[PDB]
């Protein structure tokens, strides 16, 4: 599914993510925004041989297990296709777990290089929410 900006907002919000760990909303449209262009089943493989997952592209290394990713683990307890779905409440339940690691939002290269320090409110503007 490919969510438009604010049917993701508020898919986020309903979710709980707004203001989670004191990230506003915009930050993680923001993120999902240039993660993967709002697209539930984007997947790019790392050089590694890791792959990133979902509409927050979350990495095999460490947080969903894809049998094919040497030695990582599986932090979100969950299949890396459950990040791919429609539905968006596993991608944010294992987001939320992620970003309540000390480095925060910085752990989405995106958001880190894309996001942080811009008027991310600018994401949400318009919607209904
Ligand atoms: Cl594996
Ligand atoms: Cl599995
Ligand atoms: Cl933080
Ligand atoms: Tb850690």
Same mark, same amino acid.
């Given at each position: 599914?490919? &969510?438009?900006?604010?049917?993701?907002?508020?898919?986020?919000?309903?979710?709980?993510?707004?203001?989670?760990?004191?990230?506003?909303?915009?930050?993680?449209?923001?993120?999902?925004? &240039?993660?993967?262009? &709002?697209?539930?089943?984007?997947? @790019?493989? @790392?050089?590694?041989?890791?792959?990133?997952?979902?509409?927050?592209? +979350? @990495?095999? /290394?460490?947080?969903?297990?894809?049998?094919?990713? =040497?030695?990582? /683990?599986?932090?979100? @307890?969950? =299949?890396?296709?459950?990040?791919?779905?429609?539905? +968006?409440?596993?991608?944010?339940?294992?987001?939320?777990?992620?970003?309540?690691?000390?480095?925060?939002?910085?752990?989405?290269?995106?958001?880190?290089?894309?996001?942080?320090?811009?008027?991310?409110?600018?994401?949400? /503007?318009?919607? /209904?929410?």
């Amino acid at each position: 599914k490919v &969510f438009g900006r604010c049917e993701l907002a508020a898919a986020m919000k309903r979710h709980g993510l707004d203001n989670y760990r004191g990230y506003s909303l915009g930050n993680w449209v923001c993120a999902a925004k &240039f993660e993967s262009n &709002f697209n539930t089943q984007a997947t @790019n493989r @790392n050089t590694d041989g890791s792959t990133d997952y979902g509409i927050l592209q +979350i @990495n095999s /290394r460490w947080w969903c297990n894809d049998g094919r990713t =040497p030695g990582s /683990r599986n932090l979100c @307890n969950i =299949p890396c296709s459950a990040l791919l779905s429609s539905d +968006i409440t596993a991608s944010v339940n294992c987001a939320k777990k992620i970003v309540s690691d000390g480095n925060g939002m910085n752990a989405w290269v995106a958001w880190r290089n894309r996001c942080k320090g811009t008027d991310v409110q600018a994401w949400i /503007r318009g919607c /209904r929410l």
